[PDB]
């Protein structure tokens, strides 16, 4: 009940979620980069088949 009664606690648990979300979206950026590399090697593949 002390956590529910306090408010600076609520400020801190509001901030730590954003601090988590920063790392989550950074790893999402890395995932998107590796998907882009996969698409690139697919394009090189089909160029070789055309040749």
């Amino acid at each position: 009940q002390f956590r529910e009664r306090c408010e600076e606690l609520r400020v801190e648990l509001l901030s730590i979620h954003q601090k988590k979300v920063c790392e989550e979206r950074k790893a999402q950026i890395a995932f998107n980069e590796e998907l882009s590399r996969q698409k690139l090697v697919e394009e090189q593949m089909f160029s070789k088949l055309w040749e």
Partner: protein
Amino acid sequence: MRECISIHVGQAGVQIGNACWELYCLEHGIQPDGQMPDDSFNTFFSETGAGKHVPRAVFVDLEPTVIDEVRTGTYRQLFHPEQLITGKEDAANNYARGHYTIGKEIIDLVLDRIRKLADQCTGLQGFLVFHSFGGGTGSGFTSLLMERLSVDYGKKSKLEFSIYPAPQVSTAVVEPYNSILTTHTTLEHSDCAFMVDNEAIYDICRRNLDIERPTYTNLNRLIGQIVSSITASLRFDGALNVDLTEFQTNLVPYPRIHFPLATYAPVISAEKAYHEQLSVAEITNACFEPANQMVKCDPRHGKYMACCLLYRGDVVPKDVNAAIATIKTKRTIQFVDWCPTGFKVGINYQPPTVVPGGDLAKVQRAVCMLSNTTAIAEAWARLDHKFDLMYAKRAFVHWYVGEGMEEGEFSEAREDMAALEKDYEEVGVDS
């Protein structure tokens, strides 16, 4: 306790449903096998003795090439094999074939499976039927589907998600014929029918999500977040919660007007969430932007009746009520005079999840919208003239006449649509 049945009809129904069910397992910690690696799953899943969950979905279709990749995919073993209902030959873009000839062969099989999921439930909250107005199975077979549930099930909620044909981009020719005949059945045999257009989602996915080359993967990922917003008040606690029965009564002013408009916000990329601050007041201004609407109708021409709002994440009641005050002061946004208390507020706690391989970002706080404008008169008047243009010389009518229905159903459905447009003129006019 709160329970709901999903009925995905047609190829548009199955492909939307696969996007919905991949995200629901992520929200509730379900492996593709169906077992866990806390009764939140009870709203969509049925619990067996072996610690397995089975979704309360019925995938019904008239062609096998849409449903077999469900039967042999990654999620081949979550679904019960008899939920996936397959017809023998498709309606082939015919409202008549799905209603009169082909749909009458498997409709008896569907209603038994609809019966076998509602007797398990201790109490039913609603239904969800997902359909498109383009094809025949999503229009014709869905038409007599409602009339069997309306007689059999008295006043149970049957929510609808519709893919209304885009105003200029369409894939078929008899597609305007399907939309006129299906509004006769969704008027008198539906509780609430949502409206989303395809062409709006392509424009949003290009400009906002920074995707030059979209596919139905990215479109159905956006649609599944809207139902996940609605169902989050069923499944997770909130400061104040809105049920399906709740906004069903508080959105529609008249029984003939049950076609809301959806809008999701924010719709931003993962490289730009690094940049923009995402707050409560910022996201609710993006709900009223005519650019970011999910229907190709401009609400600046029309006047708002009411707005249903659903906020999810790290949101407090003061920032919502402060930002509502900002919107009402401006002159560019109008409301009807006989509804001053226009808004309705929904607040939840659990933030939205991110799918693997998706295209959104990790969002701390988002917002949905289920608004009702008088701008949907323009989306019907252009479809009224297109259907009148084809039917004047009687093109493509011999296919529908020779399959079970006579000539005059178009003439009575046009007058119903012509009368339905005049309801919007009389309700919207200030007195």
